Amino acid sequence: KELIEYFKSQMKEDPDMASAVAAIRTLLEFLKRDKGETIQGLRANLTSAIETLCGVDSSVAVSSGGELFLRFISLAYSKCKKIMIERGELFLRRISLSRNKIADLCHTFIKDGATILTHAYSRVVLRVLEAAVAAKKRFSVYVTESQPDLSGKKMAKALCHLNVPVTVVLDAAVGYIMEKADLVIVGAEGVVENGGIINKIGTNQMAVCAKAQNKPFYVVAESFKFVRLFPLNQQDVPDKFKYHPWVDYTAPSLITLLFTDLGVLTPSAVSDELIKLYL
Amino acid sequence: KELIEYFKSQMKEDPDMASAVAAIRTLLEFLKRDKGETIQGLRANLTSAIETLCGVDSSVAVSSGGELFLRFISLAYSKCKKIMIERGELFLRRISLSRNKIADLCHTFIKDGATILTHAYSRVVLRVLEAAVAAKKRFSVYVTESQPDLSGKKMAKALCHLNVPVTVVLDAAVGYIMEKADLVIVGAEGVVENGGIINKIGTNQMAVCAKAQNKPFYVVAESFKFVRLFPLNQQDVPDKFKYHPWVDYTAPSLITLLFTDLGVLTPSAVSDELIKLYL
Amino acid sequence: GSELSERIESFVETLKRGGGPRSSEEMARETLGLLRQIITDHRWSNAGELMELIRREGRRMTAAQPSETTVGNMVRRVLKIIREEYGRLHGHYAQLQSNIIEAINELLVELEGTMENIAAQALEHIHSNEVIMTIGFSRTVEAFLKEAARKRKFHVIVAECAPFCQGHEMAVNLSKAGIETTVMTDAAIFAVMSRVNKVIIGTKTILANGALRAVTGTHTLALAAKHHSTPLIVCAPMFKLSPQFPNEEDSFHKFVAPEEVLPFTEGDILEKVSVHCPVFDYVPPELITLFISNIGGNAPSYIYRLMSELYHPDDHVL
Ligand SMILES: O=C(COc1ccc(Cl)cc1)N[C@H]1CC[C@H](NC(=O)COc2ccc(Cl)cc2)CC1
Numbered sequence A, B: 001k002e003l004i005e006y007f008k009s010q011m012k013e014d015p016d017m018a019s020a021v022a023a024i025r026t027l028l029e030f031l032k033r034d035k036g037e038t039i040q041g042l043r044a045n046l047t048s049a050i051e052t053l054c055g056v057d058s059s060v061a062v063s064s065g066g067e068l069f070l071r072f073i074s075l076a077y078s079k080c081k082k083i084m085i086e087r088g089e090l091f092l093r094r095i096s097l098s099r100n101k102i103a104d105l106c107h108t109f110i111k112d113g114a115t116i117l118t119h120a121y122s123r124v125v126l127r128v129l130e131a132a133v134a135a136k137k138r139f140s141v142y143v144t145e146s147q148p149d150l151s152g153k154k155m156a157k158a159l160c161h162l163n164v165p166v167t168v169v170l171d172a173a174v175g176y177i178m179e180k181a182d183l184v185i186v187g188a189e190g191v192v193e194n195g196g197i198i199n200k201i202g203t204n205q206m207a208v209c210a211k212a213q214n215k216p217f218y219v220v221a222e223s224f225k226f227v228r229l230f231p232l233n234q235q236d237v238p239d240k241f242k243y244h245p246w247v248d249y250t251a252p253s254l255i256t257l258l259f260t261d262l263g264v265l266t267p268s269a270v271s272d273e274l275i276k277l278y279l
Numbered sequence C: 001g002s003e004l005s006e007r008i009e010s011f012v013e014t015l016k017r018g019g020g021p022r023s024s025e026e027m028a029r030e031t032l033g034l035l036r037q038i039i040t041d042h043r044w045s046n047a048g049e050l051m052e053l054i055r056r057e058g059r060r061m062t063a064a065q066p067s068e069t070t071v072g073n074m075v076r077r078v079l080k081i082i083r084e085e086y087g088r089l090h091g092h093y094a095q096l097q098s099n100i101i102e103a104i105n106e107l108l109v110e111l112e113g114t115m116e117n118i119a120a121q122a123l124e125h126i127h128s129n130e131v132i133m134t135i136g137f138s139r140t141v142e143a144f145l146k147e148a149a150r151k152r153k154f155h156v157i158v159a160e161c162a163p164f165c166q167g168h169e170m171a172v173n174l175s176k177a178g179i180e181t182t183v184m185t186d187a188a189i190f191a192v193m194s195r196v197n198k199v200i201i202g203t204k205t206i207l208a209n210g211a212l213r214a215v216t217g218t219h220t221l222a223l224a225a226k227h228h229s230t231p232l233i234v235c236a237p238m239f240k241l242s243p244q245f246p247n248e249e250d251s252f253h254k255f256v257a258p259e260e261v262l263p264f265t266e267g268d269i270l271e272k273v274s275v276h277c278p279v280f281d282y283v284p285p286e287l288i289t290l291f292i293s294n295i296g297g298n299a300p301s302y303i304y305r306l307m308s309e310l311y312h313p314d315d316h317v318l
Helices: A003-013 A019-034 A041-056 A060-074 A078-109 A123-134 A151-160 A174-180 A203-212 A269-277 B003-013 B019-034 B041-056 B060-074 B078-109 B123-134 B151-160 B174-180 B203-212 B269-277 C002-017 C024-040 C047-064 C069-090 C094-111 C113-125 C139-148 C166-176 C186-193 C218-228 C264-271 C300-310
Strands: A115-118 A140-144 A166-169 A183-187 A197-200 A217-220 A247-250 A257-260 A263-265 B115-118 B140-144 B166-169 B183-187 B197-200 B217-220 B247-250 B257-260 B263-265 C130-135 C154-159 C181-184 C198-201 C212-215 C232-235 C280-283 C290-292
Touching: A003 A019, A003 A041, A019 A041, A019 A060, A019 A078, A041 A060, A060 A078, A078 A123, A078 A217, A078 A257, A078 A263, A115 A174, A123 A151, A123 A183, A123 A217, A140 A151, A140 A174, A151 A166, A174 A203, A174 B203, A183 A197, A183 A203, A197 A203, A203 A217, A203 A247, A203 B174, A203 B203, A257 A269, A263 A269, B003 B019, B003 B041, B019 B041, B019 B060, B019 B078, B041 B060, B060 B078, B078 B123, B078 B217, B078 B257, B078 B263, B115 B174, B123 B151, B123 B183, B123 B217, B140 B151, B140 B174, B151 B166, B174 B203, B183 B197, B183 B203, B197 B203, B203 B217, B203 B247, B257 B269, B263 B269, B269 C300, C002 C024, C002 C047, C024 C047, C024 C069, C024 C094, C047 C069, C069 C094, C069 C300, C094 C113, C113 C139, C113 C232, C113 C290, C130 C139, C130 C166, C130 C186, C130 C218, C139 C166, C139 C198, C139 C232, C154 C166, C154 C186, C166 C181, C181 C186, C186 C218, C198 C218, C212 C218, C218 C232, C218 C280, C290 C300
Parallel strands: A115 A140, A115 A183, A140 A166, A183 A217, A217 A257, B115 B140, B115 B183, B140 B166, B183 B217, B217 B257, C130 C154, C130 C198, C154 C181, C198 C232, C232 C290
Antiparallel strands: A197 A247, A257 A263, B197 B247, B257 B263, C212 C280
C-alpha cells in the first residue's frame, strides 16, 4: 500500500523512535496527502488508516494514539480541515516534548543510593534514568531479561553506556531480587481507565511482588498511551493486543504513581483525564 | 576418586532417579566398602563423603539427606556398625517407598476438571499426576518453562505421554495465567524448619501470586528433603545452594499443605518432625 | 443377640432419616454405648477380628450419614483404644475385654466433662464491656457465654442462620441470663463487624488441616473477622475432631430440601430455577485464631498433633 511501507521505513528511519509517534506521523501525512474534503468521508479514510496500522502492529499504544488524536482532529467545512492541520501540527509538537517533560518531572523521584528495578527495554525509562544520571545521581539497576524478546539484554546494553551499574536479572528472579530493589520503574505500553497498565507479560508479576513487599511501583508513560479500556481480569483485555500472550494487565491497586507529561498523577487521575477528554 | 565416578554413573545408571537417593546409595556403599571400625573415626569418612558429594552437586536435597541419615546411622562398638548397616538398609527401603506413598496420598487432592499449575520438572509431581490420571482423572496442566534450564519443556514432554492436555507457559506468564489455574503443585527441593521450601527460582513468584489470588499452593516432597535451615529473606539462604541464583526461598506463609511420606502436613508440622528428630 | 442387631439398626436408621439425638454430645454418648455393647455381645477372641467387625459396622454407620462425623471419629477413637490395649498386652483375653471396657468407661466419664471444662475455661477469654458475635446455635458456645456472664458484663451479637434460624433461640437463651443480646440477619454480618471485638462460634467437625465444617454462612463471618483482624475463637470439644482431610474426602456439604430456601407456593418458577440449600460450609484454618477444647486452648497449627494423639494413622480411612 502506501502507509505500510512508510511506517516500516519510519521504523527504519529512526531506530530511536517510538511506534505511536510514527503512527501519528503516518496518519498526519496520509490526511495531508490525499486531500479528503468531505465532512463524513474524511473519517472513513482515517479509521482505515488506524485499522491498517494496528493490523500491521499489535500495539495498544498505536490504537490509543489513533483514537485520541482522531478525536482531537475531529473536534477541530473548508476552514475545518484548514484549522485541523494546524491543531495536528501543534499536537505533534506537544507529543514530541512529551518524553522530555516526562524525564524532567520524574528524574527527581529517584533517591540516590537506591536500586532501580526495571522490566524490558523502554524509551521513557531510559530517558528518565539519563536525566537522573545527568543530575549527578548514582544508583544500581536490575533489569528483567524479558524472555519472549530479549529486550532486557538490550536495555542493559543501552544503560551500560550511561555509566551506571546495571545487572540484568532472570525473568523469574524478580521474586528473589525484589528485597534488594528500593523501587520499581516500568514504562507502560498502555494505560486503562481505572489506572492499570497493559504492559509486557512480567509487569503484573513486578507489581504483585511490589505489593508483597510494599516497595514503590512507579510507571512512566506518555498521555497518548491513555486507552479507554477496562479489563476486569487478564482475559478481559483485547486479544488482538495480546498477540503465549505478549502483553498483560496490571490493576491500579498495584501502582503507586504515574509520571506523564500532564504531571505526576495518582492512578485515580487518569480516568479523570479520560472522561474530561470524553474518549 | 571413588565416590565421584560412582555417583556420576548412578546418574547415568538411572536417568529416572533422584539425586538424594543416589547420594544415600553412594554413602552406604562407601561405608560398607572401606570397613571403618572406629567409634569416632567413622564420622570423619562420613562427613568427607557428604562434603565431597555436595561439592560436586550444589543441591540442598543431597546435603539434607546426608545430614539426616548420617545422624540416623550414628543414632544406631562392634555390634554398633553391624546393626547400623541393618538400619541403613531399611532406611533405603523406606526412602524407596517414599515416592509411591507420596503419589498415593496426594493424587486424591486434585478435583477433576481442575487446572494444575506446575513449575519446572520434578519427579514427585510427575508421580502424583500419574497416580491421578491412573485413577481416571481429567485435568488441564500449565507448566513454567524454567528459563535457566529448560526443564519446563522436559516436563511437558514427559506429561504429554500421560495423555493429558499440557500447555507449557512462559516463565513470566504465571501472573497472566494464575486466574486460569485452580491450584498450584510444585515439588520442593528442600524444606526449611518453618515450613518454607527452597525450590527453583520461580517458585516464590508462584506462591506470591497464589496468595494474590487465594489459590491453593500445594507442595510435594520426600522427608529426606527436610533441611534444618531458617532463612529470613532470600539472601539468608546458603549461597552454596544458590549456585544469577538458581534456587530461592518461599515462606510457609505462602504454602497451604505439604504432601510427604509422613502424611499430609501443615507447614507447621515439619518443624515438629525436625525437632522430634533433633536435627 | 438380636437385641444388639435391632439396636444397631434403629441407630443407623435414626442417623439416616433425621437428627437423633439432637445434641452431638448425646450422639457421642449413644455411639459409645453401642460400641461397648458390640464389643461385649460378640464372640471375639483375637483383637483383630474385633477391630474388623468394628470397622465394618463403622463403615455402615458412616454410610448412614456422612455429614455426622462424630460417630465415625469416635469409632476411630474406640479403634485406637483397642490398638493401645493390644499394644499394652502384647508389646490376656478376658482381661483384654475388661480393660477395653474400662477404657471406654473413662472415655465416657471424660466425655461429659468437656462441656464443664470449656465453661470453666471461658472466663479467661472474656473481659468487661466486650462485644461478641456468634452465628447460629451452639450449646457449647452458649454455655461458654452464660458462664462468662456470671462474672462479666458484655454484649453478644447473634447472626441468625438462614434458612434454619437457630440463632433466634440462641439469642433468647442468652437473654434469659441477662446477656445483652442483639439479633440480626446474616446479611448484616460485615456491616456490623467493624464494632465487634471477638467472634466465638461452635462447629460440627474439625478437619486434620485445621479447617472446620460449620453451619453455612460462618465462612463469610470468618472472612469478615480476618478483614477486620478480629480474633475468631472456636469452642469445640475434642470429640468433633475428624482425622479426614478437606479434599481427600467425599460428601462435605449437607444439602437439605430447598423448601427451606424457596417455598413450594412460588409456583411455576420452581421448574425453571435451581435452588440450593447447603447446611454446612468449609472454613480454612487461615481464618481461625484459636481453638478452645476440653484440654485447653490450641492454635489450628496443632490440630494435626492432636490427631496423632487421638487416631491411629492407618484408621483414617475406616
Ligand atoms: O454498647 C455496646 C453495644 O455494641 C453493639 C451492639 C449491637 C450492635 Cl448491632 C453492634 C455493637 N458496646 C460497647 C462496647 C465498649 C465500647 N467502648 C467503651 O466502653 C470504652 O472503650 C475503650 C476505653 C478505653 C480503651 Cl483503652 C479502649 C476502649 C462502647 C460500646
